[PDB]
Protein backbone atom coordinates (compact mmCIF):
# COMPACT_ATOMS: atom_id res chain seq x y z
CA UNK A 1 0.00 0.00 0.00
CA UNK A 2 0.91 3.70 -0.07
CA UNK A 3 -0.04 6.91 1.73
CA UNK A 4 -3.13 7.46 -0.45
CA UNK A 5 -4.65 4.21 0.84
CA UNK A 6 -4.04 5.30 4.44
CA UNK A 7 -5.67 8.68 3.77
CA UNK A 8 -8.68 6.93 2.22
CA UNK A 9 -8.86 4.65 5.27
CA UNK A 10 -8.86 7.67 7.60
CA UNK A 11 -11.59 9.32 5.52
CA UNK A 12 -13.72 6.17 5.66
CA UNK A 13 -13.19 6.00 9.43
CA UNK A 14 -14.44 9.57 9.72
CA UNK A 15 -17.43 8.79 7.50
CA UNK A 16 -18.36 5.85 9.72
CA UNK A 17 -17.86 7.93 12.88
CA UNK A 18 -20.14 10.69 11.50
CA UNK A 19 -23.06 8.51 10.40
CA UNK A 20 -26.75 9.22 10.98
CA UNK A 21 -29.25 7.30 13.11
CA UNK A 22 -32.89 6.26 12.69
CA UNK A 23 -35.76 7.69 14.76
CA UNK A 24 -35.56 5.82 18.07
CA UNK A 25 -37.51 8.63 19.76
CA UNK A 26 -40.74 7.23 18.31
CA UNK A 27 -40.02 3.81 19.83
CA UNK A 28 -39.19 5.37 23.20
CA UNK A 29 -42.42 7.38 23.01
CA UNK A 30 -44.39 4.19 22.31
CA UNK A 31 -42.74 2.50 25.29
CA UNK A 32 -43.67 5.44 27.52
CA UNK A 33 -47.25 5.63 26.20
CA UNK A 34 -47.65 1.94 27.05
CA UNK A 35 -47.61 3.00 30.72
CA UNK A 36 -50.50 5.42 30.17
CA UNK A 37 -52.43 2.72 28.31
CA UNK A 38 -51.93 0.32 31.23
CA UNK A 39 -52.96 2.98 33.75
CA UNK A 40 -56.12 3.88 31.82
CA UNK A 41 -57.05 0.20 31.37
CA UNK A 42 -57.64 -0.12 35.13
CA UNK A 43 -60.71 2.13 35.27
CA UNK A 44 -62.83 -0.04 32.95
CA UNK A 45 -64.41 -2.12 35.72
CA UNK A 46 -66.00 0.76 37.65
CA UNK A 47 -67.36 2.47 34.53
CA UNK A 48 -68.81 -0.77 33.18
CA UNK A 49 -70.39 -1.65 36.54
CA UNK A 50 -71.98 1.80 36.85
CA UNK A 51 -73.34 1.62 33.30
CA UNK A 52 -74.76 -1.86 33.89
CA UNK A 53 -76.37 -1.02 37.24
CA UNK A 54 -77.67 2.48 36.38
CA UNK A 55 -78.34 2.61 32.62
CA UNK A 56 -76.07 5.58 31.89
CA UNK A 57 -72.35 6.30 31.82
CA UNK A 58 -70.71 8.12 34.75
CA UNK A 59 -70.14 11.81 34.23
CA UNK A 60 -67.08 12.28 36.44
CA UNK A 61 -64.65 10.43 38.69
CA UNK A 62 -66.84 11.23 41.70
CA UNK A 63 -69.71 8.91 40.77
CA UNK A 64 -67.59 6.61 38.63
CA UNK A 65 -66.10 5.18 41.83
CA UNK A 66 -62.48 6.23 41.34
CA UNK A 67 -60.06 8.78 42.77
CA UNK A 68 -59.34 12.31 41.60
CA UNK A 69 -57.69 12.96 38.23
CA UNK A 70 -54.54 14.47 39.76
CA UNK A 71 -54.09 11.42 42.01
CA UNK A 72 -53.91 8.77 39.25
CA UNK A 73 -50.33 9.52 38.20
CA UNK A 74 -47.24 7.55 37.25
CA UNK A 75 -43.65 8.14 36.18
CA UNK A 76 -44.80 9.51 32.81
CA UNK A 77 -48.54 10.12 33.38
CA UNK A 78 -49.83 13.16 35.27
CA UNK A 79 -53.63 12.75 35.19
CA UNK A 80 -56.38 10.33 34.18
CA UNK A 81 -59.94 11.65 33.81
CA UNK A 82 -63.36 10.11 33.21
CA UNK A 83 -66.04 12.09 31.36
CA UNK A 84 -69.30 10.52 30.13
CA UNK A 85 -67.77 7.05 30.18
CA UNK A 86 -64.61 8.13 28.31
CA UNK A 87 -61.19 7.71 29.92
CA UNK A 88 -58.47 10.19 28.96
CA UNK A 89 -54.84 10.11 30.13
CA UNK A 90 -52.38 13.00 29.88
CA UNK A 91 -48.58 12.96 29.75
CA UNK A 92 -46.21 14.86 32.03
CA UNK A 93 -44.96 18.30 31.05
CA UNK A 94 -41.30 17.67 31.94
CA UNK A 95 -38.70 14.91 32.29
CA UNK A 96 -40.35 12.95 29.46
CA UNK A 97 -39.82 12.50 25.73
CA UNK A 98 -40.03 15.69 23.68
CA UNK A 99 -42.55 14.34 21.16
CA UNK A 100 -45.17 13.26 23.71
CA UNK A 101 -44.94 16.25 26.05
CA UNK A 102 -48.41 17.08 27.42
CA UNK A 103 -50.52 15.00 25.04
CA UNK A 104 -53.68 12.96 25.53
CA UNK A 105 -55.03 9.55 24.51
CA UNK A 106 -58.50 8.14 25.07
CA UNK A 107 -60.44 4.92 25.63
CA UNK A 108 -64.17 4.44 25.05
CA UNK A 109 -66.73 1.66 24.72
CA UNK A 110 -69.82 1.03 22.59
CA UNK A 111 -72.69 -1.25 23.59
CA UNK A 112 -73.84 -4.03 21.26
CA UNK A 113 -76.77 -6.43 21.40
CA UNK A 114 -74.65 -9.22 22.90
CA UNK A 115 -71.29 -7.71 23.85
CA UNK A 116 -69.48 -4.52 24.85
CA UNK A 117 -66.65 -3.47 22.52
CA UNK A 118 -63.75 -1.29 23.67
CA UNK A 119 -61.74 1.09 21.50
CA UNK A 120 -58.43 2.88 22.01
CA UNK A 121 -56.90 5.79 20.12
CA UNK A 122 -56.96 9.55 19.77
CA UNK A 123 -59.03 11.70 22.16
CA UNK A 124 -62.82 11.71 21.80
CA UNK A 125 -65.73 13.21 23.73
CA UNK A 126 -69.29 12.11 24.50
CA UNK A 127 -71.94 14.81 24.79
CA UNK A 128 -74.79 13.16 26.72
CA UNK A 129 -74.66 10.34 29.25
CA UNK A 130 -77.19 8.30 27.23
CA UNK A 131 -75.58 8.79 23.80
CA UNK A 132 -74.19 5.90 21.76
CA UNK A 133 -71.98 8.01 19.44
CA UNK A 134 -68.69 9.86 19.87
CA UNK A 135 -66.90 12.58 17.90
CA UNK A 136 -63.52 14.29 17.83
CA UNK A 137 -62.29 15.81 21.08
CA UNK A 138 -61.77 19.48 20.23
CA UNK A 139 -61.17 21.73 17.24
CA UNK A 140 -59.28 24.45 19.14
CA UNK A 141 -56.46 22.42 20.69
CA UNK A 142 -53.32 20.53 19.68
CA UNK A 143 -53.11 18.04 22.58
CA UNK A 144 -53.36 14.90 20.45
CA UNK A 145 -50.90 12.01 20.50
CA UNK A 146 -49.51 11.50 17.02
CA UNK A 147 -50.15 8.28 15.12
CA UNK A 148 -46.43 7.43 15.05
CA UNK A 149 -46.30 7.32 18.87
CA UNK A 150 -49.10 4.75 19.30
CA UNK A 151 -49.23 0.97 18.86
CA UNK A 152 -50.82 -0.32 15.68
CA UNK A 153 -53.72 -1.77 17.70
CA UNK A 154 -54.40 1.53 19.52
CA UNK A 155 -55.27 3.52 16.38
CA UNK A 156 -59.05 3.92 16.08
CA UNK A 157 -61.20 6.65 14.57
CA UNK A 158 -64.22 8.30 16.17
CA UNK A 159 -66.43 6.71 13.49
CA UNK A 160 -65.49 3.13 14.41
CA UNK A 161 -68.37 0.85 15.37
Amino acid sequence: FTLIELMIVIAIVGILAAVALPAYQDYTARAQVSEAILLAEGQKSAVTEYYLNHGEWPGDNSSAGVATSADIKGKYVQSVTVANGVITAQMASSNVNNEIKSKKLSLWAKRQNGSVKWFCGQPVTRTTATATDVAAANGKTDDKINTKHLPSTCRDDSSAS
Epitope: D60, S63, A83, N84, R126, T127, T128, A129
Partner: nanobody, 125 residues
Protein backbone atom coordinates in the same frame (compact mmCIF):
# COMPACT_ATOMS: atom_id res chain seq x y z
CA UNK B 1 -96.04 21.83 34.30
CA UNK B 2 -92.39 22.43 35.19
CA UNK B 3 -91.26 26.01 34.60
CA UNK B 4 -87.82 27.57 35.03
CA UNK B 5 -87.38 31.20 36.13
CA UNK B 6 -84.03 33.01 36.12
CA UNK B 7 -82.97 36.04 38.14
CA UNK B 8 -79.95 38.18 38.94
CA UNK B 9 -79.44 39.97 35.64
CA UNK B 10 -78.15 43.50 35.38
CA UNK B 11 -75.16 45.64 34.42
CA UNK B 12 -71.74 45.15 36.03
CA UNK B 13 -68.55 47.07 35.31
CA UNK B 14 -65.55 45.10 33.99
CA UNK B 15 -63.62 43.27 36.68
CA UNK B 16 -66.71 42.90 38.88
CA UNK B 17 -68.89 39.96 39.83
CA UNK B 18 -72.46 38.73 39.42
CA UNK B 19 -74.59 35.83 40.67
CA UNK B 20 -77.48 34.13 38.87
CA UNK B 21 -80.19 31.76 40.07
CA UNK B 22 -82.36 29.27 38.15
CA UNK B 23 -85.20 27.94 40.31
CA UNK B 24 -88.50 26.14 39.78
CA UNK B 25 -91.79 26.67 41.60
CA UNK B 26 -93.98 23.80 42.77
CA UNK B 27 -91.63 21.08 41.50
CA UNK B 28 -88.48 19.38 42.77
CA UNK B 29 -85.26 19.40 40.73
CA UNK B 30 -83.44 16.30 41.98
CA UNK B 31 -83.49 13.82 39.06
CA UNK B 32 -82.43 16.43 36.48
CA UNK B 33 -79.11 18.02 35.52
CA UNK B 34 -79.10 21.82 35.38
CA UNK B 35 -77.13 23.51 32.63
CA UNK B 36 -76.48 27.11 31.64
CA UNK B 37 -76.47 28.36 28.05
CA UNK B 38 -75.43 31.70 26.56
CA UNK B 39 -76.43 33.31 23.25
CA UNK B 40 -74.53 36.35 22.00
CA UNK B 41 -76.29 38.98 19.86
CA UNK B 42 -76.07 37.77 16.28
CA UNK B 43 -74.35 34.51 17.26
CA UNK B 44 -75.51 30.95 17.83
CA UNK B 45 -76.32 29.64 21.30
CA UNK B 46 -73.53 27.87 23.18
CA UNK B 47 -72.96 26.20 26.54
CA UNK B 48 -71.32 27.55 29.68
CA UNK B 49 -71.57 25.09 32.57
CA UNK B 50 -73.46 22.01 33.73
CA UNK B 51 -73.97 20.26 37.07
CA UNK B 52 -75.04 16.72 37.91
CA UNK B 53 -78.14 15.65 39.83
CA UNK B 54 -76.26 15.09 43.11
CA UNK B 55 -73.84 17.99 42.66
CA UNK B 56 -70.59 16.07 42.28
CA UNK B 57 -69.87 16.41 38.56
CA UNK B 58 -69.08 19.83 37.08
CA UNK B 59 -67.72 20.98 33.72
CA UNK B 60 -67.21 24.42 32.18
CA UNK B 61 -66.40 25.85 28.76
CA UNK B 62 -62.90 26.66 27.55
CA UNK B 63 -63.34 30.44 27.70
CA UNK B 64 -65.08 30.52 31.11
CA UNK B 65 -62.88 27.97 32.90
CA UNK B 66 -61.30 29.35 36.06
CA UNK B 67 -63.65 32.34 36.37
CA UNK B 68 -67.11 30.75 36.76
CA UNK B 69 -68.39 28.53 39.56
CA UNK B 70 -71.57 26.44 39.69
CA UNK B 71 -73.23 25.24 42.90
CA UNK B 72 -76.35 23.23 43.68
CA UNK B 73 -78.65 23.14 46.71
CA UNK B 74 -81.09 20.30 47.38
CA UNK B 75 -83.04 21.65 50.37
CA UNK B 76 -84.21 24.52 48.16
CA UNK B 77 -84.79 23.82 44.46
CA UNK B 78 -82.32 26.38 43.14
CA UNK B 79 -79.00 26.36 41.28
CA UNK B 80 -76.45 29.16 41.61
CA UNK B 81 -73.89 30.32 39.05
CA UNK B 82 -71.16 32.68 40.27
CA UNK B 83 -69.45 34.97 37.75
CA UNK B 84 -66.03 36.49 38.44
CA UNK B 85 -63.66 38.66 36.39
CA UNK B 86 -66.23 39.78 33.84
CA UNK B 87 -65.15 40.83 30.34
CA UNK B 88 -66.90 42.78 27.56
CA UNK B 89 -67.00 39.61 25.45
CA UNK B 90 -69.30 37.92 28.00
CA UNK B 91 -72.30 40.18 27.28
CA UNK B 92 -75.10 37.89 26.07
CA UNK B 93 -78.43 36.32 27.03
CA UNK B 94 -78.26 33.58 29.67
CA UNK B 95 -80.56 30.55 29.80
CA UNK B 96 -81.02 27.65 32.21
CA UNK B 97 -82.19 24.17 31.24
CA UNK B 98 -82.94 20.85 32.94
CA UNK B 99 -82.34 17.37 31.57
CA UNK B 100 -79.61 14.77 31.04
CA UNK B 101 -76.02 15.49 32.05
CA UNK B 102 -74.11 17.03 29.14
CA UNK B 103 -70.57 18.09 28.28
CA UNK B 104 -70.55 21.73 27.14
CA UNK B 105 -67.66 21.12 24.72
CA UNK B 106 -69.29 18.62 22.38
CA UNK B 107 -71.43 18.46 19.26
CA UNK B 108 -75.06 19.41 19.84
CA UNK B 109 -75.11 20.34 23.54
CA UNK B 110 -78.87 21.04 23.38
CA UNK B 111 -79.83 17.46 22.43
CA UNK B 112 -80.01 16.35 26.08
CA UNK B 113 -82.37 19.01 27.48
CA UNK B 114 -86.17 18.83 27.50
CA UNK B 115 -87.01 21.97 29.52
CA UNK B 116 -86.04 25.58 28.92
CA UNK B 117 -86.35 29.02 30.50
CA UNK B 118 -87.26 32.48 29.26
CA UNK B 119 -83.77 33.88 29.82
CA UNK B 120 -82.19 37.00 31.28
CA UNK B 121 -80.10 39.80 29.78
CA UNK B 122 -76.64 40.66 31.14
CA UNK B 123 -74.61 43.60 29.82
CA UNK B 124 -70.97 44.40 30.58
CA UNK B 125 -69.95 48.02 30.04
Amino acid sequence: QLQLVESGGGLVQPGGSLRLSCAASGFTLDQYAIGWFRQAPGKEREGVSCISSRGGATNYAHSVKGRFTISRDNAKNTVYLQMNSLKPEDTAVYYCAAGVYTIVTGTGPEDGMDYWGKGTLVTVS
